Design a protein around this ligand. Sequence first.
Ligand SMILES: Cc1ncc(COP(=O)(O)O)c(CN)c1O
Ligand SMILES: Cc1ncc(COP(=O)(O)O)c(CN)c1O
Lengths: 435, 435
Amino acid sequence: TTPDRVHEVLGRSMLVDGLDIVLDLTRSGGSYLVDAITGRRYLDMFTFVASSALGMNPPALVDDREFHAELMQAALNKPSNSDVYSVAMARFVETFARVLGDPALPHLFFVEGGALAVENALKAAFDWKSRHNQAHGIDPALGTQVLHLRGAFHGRSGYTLSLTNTKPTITARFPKFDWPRIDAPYMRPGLDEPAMAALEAEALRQARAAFETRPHDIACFVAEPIQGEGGDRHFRPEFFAAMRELCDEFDALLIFDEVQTGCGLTGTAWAYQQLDVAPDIVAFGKKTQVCGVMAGRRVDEVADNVFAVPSRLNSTWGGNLTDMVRARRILEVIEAEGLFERAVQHGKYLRARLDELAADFPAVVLDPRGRGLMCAFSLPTTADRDELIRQLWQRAVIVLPAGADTVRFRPPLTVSTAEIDAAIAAVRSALPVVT
Amino acid sequence: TTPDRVHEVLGRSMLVDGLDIVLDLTRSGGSYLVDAITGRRYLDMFTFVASSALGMNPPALVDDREFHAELMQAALNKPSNSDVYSVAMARFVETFARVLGDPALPHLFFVEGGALAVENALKAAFDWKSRHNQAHGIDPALGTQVLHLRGAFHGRSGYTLSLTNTKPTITARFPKFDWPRIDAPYMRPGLDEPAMAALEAEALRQARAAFETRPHDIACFVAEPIQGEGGDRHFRPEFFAAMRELCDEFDALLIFDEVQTGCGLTGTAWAYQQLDVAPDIVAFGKKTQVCGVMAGRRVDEVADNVFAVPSRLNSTWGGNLTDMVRARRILEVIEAEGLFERAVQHGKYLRARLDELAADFPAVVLDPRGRGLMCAFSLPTTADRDELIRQLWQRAVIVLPAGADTVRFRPPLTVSTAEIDAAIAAVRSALPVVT
Ligand SMILES: Cc1ncc(COP(=O)(O)O)c(CN)c1O
Ligand SMILES: Cc1ncc(COP(=O)(O)O)c(CN)c1O
């Protein structure tokens, strides 16, 4: 079966709605995907939906003969890491703790898949609230609800479909829990400090009313520190600091979903580190390859929590051992090459170019925004946004849409300024055509 | 970090409740796990909880230099197969369809994780019932419930926690939907045809009453064809044939969860093939490495079902490409070496040995049973069962418990009769000690 027959073969069994290219696994490299059909190179600002930290075939992995042997040993089999431990797994865990660890969150748990990472954070919270309730004479049947935001995306699994609310297509006709949802007071152009503060006060009022009308029954508040799929919506640290206080006042855990923000993209290991808000639990995935949760802070106050009692959380495999070995090596490159700092510096560069674009196309390039390499702008209409994406595709630049009118950039941490310039040049060429 | 330090390093971050050994990834082979600490060999009747078809480091994979190159190409990166297609992926899909495919179930969907496989089958059913309802003038808000069995295990995710009901530890303190659950009329010793028929009639009565009291709101019936975690409980084909008819009478889909039964273990590609009941959807995982669903039969009667409409089902990765490449090679070995037939023949051998054991230890070795290599027996008490497992561990044989009093065998498809003899000899040595 040949590159030119891939879509035909897949189309017999599945809906084939992905990209027109066929990925060349060998010739792709760095910020470039290679189409196996034509040999055309595509500038990658999409990175498998933000899940690739170093891009394709990074030299540090590709040339490391010792790593090849370690990776191959892992890749031949697929152990259940839940039951059976290995050196390969232990090395991953200790380097994870070293590079991405937070001393307040010592408990680690791994699973395949970002939605399941968020679910296990929820399960930890449900268990914690029920037991905390029980310990203070409150009915342990209470503590089953999740406070969350409008525009959130946390996955497409049984619990996360009750939280995710972006496009109706994602959630329609699937059963849901009736959990409290509050407005998202994200930053927008032409609102100053007082205007933002009033927007936040209204979301906070809603949050407080949820807690007061469902007493002892809200186990946690969950949020993306920056909403990704819903449209790269950013929040002031003030908003989360207030939410932190409100969670503590009502004995509820604060969970950040860093599946999309995490692992260096914003310039630090985790976005929450720049907002100066301490979560009780963090869900991670995508760039970490293996998914999971880190937990601590108030979790520890319930001594028989899910991290302390066997068999409360589990899966057959406990994450994919191949992903752990790959992730271990990727983390070592990040640490060795100072890639978080490189994300800060190139993120400032990309953001500066987007500011310039906005200045040159004031009516068209709206709300340029970002934190580190997580950057975006918006268009007047969704028709303009969709056309811009098509025009970029024609120019061999891959970007992702988000929300109704956003174009998002998800470059690899190793992106160069010349590559950023090439992406910007394409947007510049395309814009007069969409107008 | 050295084998003797693995448990210490992991114990800083996680609850370490798995096996005392450290897996040697290189020296393990076939039906044997090697402890890296001692070099002791362990006879493996556990196979990473039934997820390894060929055992460790199969020669057909290990010696295949061309496959090594293909596997390495996949293992270095982790593409989002949802969006970006490859030759490696297309080869996997066409060999899956060839070796495991059913012509009535042409729609394939892949995801990481067995619980999420079952969830996507449920989502297909919820969507189908709502749309089928809508098409016949019934409120499309109806079709949100799942008929299922007592003793079922379908996973630990948001929807499957509402179905799974084995140990209370798995589900306690987690929110659940109130879905209808019926008695499981499994085969037991000392019930003849009439006695079984009466047991089945009672479960069927309960099923019928669920359908009649929740009109148009039950989207599907889900079952394991043989209940695994709940205790290797087997059902007559008559029971499922009746359920098939009842599902059709109430316009509900029949889904089989073959995550544990699937991929040759019972002697055929899928257990349902031996029961002569046609499902609408099958969830698979474990031995297939990549998880997912096959769907068809009545699914197709709703033209805008989730397999036909973009973005109704999704995940970031669409399954792990490394797992797809590994699984492709494993399927080729199964097909080339006739391993399904080998499972039938060695499964008969293992079952015959268990019958002999029961004859020699009538009061102790209870209810020997199996289909193909999926075999089990029970003990008088859970204390006896737990002690037998400890005694086998001491003799370097790994088996799994199930339910309150079952010991289960999950050998690889490539197990030899000498290896089965060694497992049986160990049980024979251990039994006088537990009595
Ligand atoms: C913030 C966030 N949380 C969770 C998920 C779900 O991750 P996965 O697709 O691996 O289930 C996503 C995926 N885009 C996400 O962006
Ligand atoms: C029948 C069945 N269904 C689903 C699952 C869940 O699979 P996973 O652990 O990969 O989520 C299991 C796991 N033992 C199972 O046995």
